[PDB]
Structure formats: C-alpha cells, structure tokens
Design a protein around this ligand. Structure first.
Ligand SMILES: [Zn+2]
Length: 369
C-alpha cells in the first residue's frame, strides 16, 4: 500500500527498506499535530467502553477508516470531546501515548494542538485540571522517552470569538513552561482569522507565541495575509493558497515565515483527481516560491500516517530530494517555539547526523544491490 492510503506514486521512485530506514532515523520536530487526532484505535475503544459512549465497535471503525476521497475527521474530534474524554486522566493518557508514538519515530520535540473550548464546555472538565493532566503526560513522556514537547491551546473557530478570549484568560491563570502559545483550527470556511483579532492581541500581550490554520479548504490567500500581517503569527499552519499570490510569497520568503504542511491533507485528497493529486497539490510548489515548509502528520492515527511516513511522502510523491529534506529539517528547527540556544544546538548536531544518514542510505542501496 501507500502511507496514509494516498494515491500510488506515479514518480518512478521505488521506496526500499533502505529508504524506510533513512526516513525513520531522521531526527525530527513535529509542529502540526492535533492531540485528538492522535488517539490510538485501541485507546479509543477503551475510552468508549468505559464511558458507555453511543458508539459501537463498528461505529468506531468508520471513524478510523481512511478512504480514497477521504472525508475530514473533525467529527471524530467532536465525538471525543462529547462522549469519550470524561476525566482529566484521559487527556494525560492520550498526550503520553501520542508523545510515545512520536518518539518512536525520532521526533525529539513535538508541539501539539488541543482545543480547550470542547474540553471545558462540552466534556465539562475544568481548564486547570485538563491542562495539568496534559502537562503531566508531557513530563512523563520526557522522562520515559526523552522527547521534549510544547502544548498549544487552540481556538475552535466554529465558536464565538469570546471563547477564544476565554482560552487566553485560562492560559494566563495557569502558566506553565510547557504551554507556549495559541493556534486556531476547525472549519475555516466563513470563519475568517480577523474575527479572532482580540484573542490574538491578548495572547501576544501575555507573552505567548501564536500560529494559525490559514488557506486550507481552498480558502482565500487573504486569510494567510491576515494571519501574518494582522494577527502577527509567528508561523503559519497549511497556507497552501498563498501560491496564488507570488508577490506575497516573495515577502514572506524574505521574512523567513515557516509554513507547517501536511501531505495527507484531507481537502486536497478529496478534491483533486487521484491521477493529479501529487502533481497539483500547492505544497509541491511552495519551496520553489522561496517559502520554508515543514512536513507533519496533523492527525496521525486518523490519517494513518506516522512521522516517518510523512517525511517519506515528500520524497516519494512530491518530488523533493534528499537535499530538500535537509532544508525541511532546518525549517522545523527555525519554526520551533524554543530559544535561540536550543535552535543553534539542534542545527549544529542534527545537520551532521542527517549527513551521515544520507551517506548510509547510499551504502545501504549499494549493499542491497
Ligand atoms: Zn491541523
């Protein structure tokens, strides 16, 4: 098969065991992953059985089925909030298990999204208890697997902008080194980023970094411009439609804005014909427009893609070379929400590591031959 059940590669590159070992060994950061999109199937089962959720073993499997013109998985996230996640400890568990799974693929630093609005308003778990539980999961995973992490409470853009302000209020009342900034997600259509100006102002005034989903679902490149130049985000999530405006691309290339990208993005898989998906995905054109991109899983267990596979897809389907992948690694370091000393250390250490893995890929290929 193919990672994420995406269309089969039409590029002539045959992925070998050597390639898979390379993609696996690559040191990685992950900057775009939703906690609730990283729940293991069997943990989903355990949560459902304990909560008595109105979801049977087979309803759980349409949830985890990843088809050829795949539907978006936002409804699964909604089901988790409404029926499955009923105690703070459930949030601890899924954070710990996500970080364990990321670490297994040599993710050394993961920044992940969680929507507090759903947890507080729908699950009925107080913010303070929810955040503490997630932070415990993070600290346990650092202890057990050596993976570092940041939590990014994220605005549910389908709810009123007052709920977004409420998140920043919660964050200010519960400061923790693990909690680094805010994002915004859920359905972008008709919920433009400027609607949430107040929460972004408040987050930045409180010393938090910010990011935003923008230009997904074919939404206008204007949304990317608004995120960067009104909300003043530190990085952008997706950003695909920016390719429609090469002038803006030039400006943001010069500013070095990092764009988190998701090869398994459901919208493009669903809307592009399978024979044109890899060819016409705007992500393919972004680096040539001068933009710094960085590949990620988004919803790894629901998209059926792990970090090693997300990196593989860039090479197998999207025409990016080994050298391009080294740049993407460096882009992830630049985009991470850590201090300059940490970034410098990662550049100095991971670049030579990458170089050795690239030489070993060549040696492994020769040995297979
Ligand atoms: Zn996302």
């Amino acid at each position: 098969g193919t990672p994420g059940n995406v269309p089969a590669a039409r590029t002539g590159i045959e992925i070998t065991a050597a390639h898979r070992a390379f993609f696996h060994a690559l040191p990685k950061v992950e900057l775009h992953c939703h906690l609730l999109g990283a729940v293991r199937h069997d943990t989903f089962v355990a949560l459902a059985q304990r909560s008595g959720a109105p979801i049977e073993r087979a309803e759980i499997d349409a949830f985890y089925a990843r088809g050829e013109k795949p539907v978006g998985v936002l409804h699964v996230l909604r089901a988790l909030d409404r029926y499955l996640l009923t105690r703070p400890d459930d949030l601890r568990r899924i954070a710990y298990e996500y970080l364990e799974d990321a670490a297994a693929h040599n993710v050394r630093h993961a920044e992940f999204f969680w929507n507090p609005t759903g947890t507080v308003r729908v699950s009925g778990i107080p913010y303070a208890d929810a955040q503490a539980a997630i932070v415990t999961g993070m600290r346990d995973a650092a202890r057990d697997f050596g993976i570092g992490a940041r939590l990014i409470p994220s605005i549910d853009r389908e709810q009123d902008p007052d709920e977004a302000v409420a998140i920043v209020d919660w964050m200010k009342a519960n400061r923790a080194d693990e909690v680094a900034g805010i994002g915004i997600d859920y359905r972008e259509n008709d919920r433009p980023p400027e609607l949430f100006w107040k929460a972004y102002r408040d987050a930045r005034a409180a010393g938090f970094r910010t990011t935003a989903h923008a230009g997904e679902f074919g939404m206008p490149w204007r949304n990317v411009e608004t995120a960067v130049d009104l909300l003043h985000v530190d990085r952008v999530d997706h950003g695909y439609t920016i390719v429609d405006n090469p002038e803006l691309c030039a400006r943001y290339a010069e500013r070095g804005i990092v764009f988190t990208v998701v090869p398994t993005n459901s919208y493009y898989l669903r809307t592009l014909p399978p024979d044109q998906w890899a060819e016409r995905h705007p992500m393919r054109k972004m680096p040539g427009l001068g933009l710094k991109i960085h590949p990620n899983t988004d919803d790894p267990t629901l998209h059926k893609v792990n970090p090693s596979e997300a990196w593989e897809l860039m090479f197998s389907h999207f025409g990016f070379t080994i050298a391009d992948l080294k740049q993407f690694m460096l882009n992830g370091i630049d985009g991470a929400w850590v201090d300059d000393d940490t970034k410098a250390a990662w550049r100095a250490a991971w670049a030579p590591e990458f170089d050795m893995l690239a030489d070993t890929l060549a040696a492994d290929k020769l040995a297979a031959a």
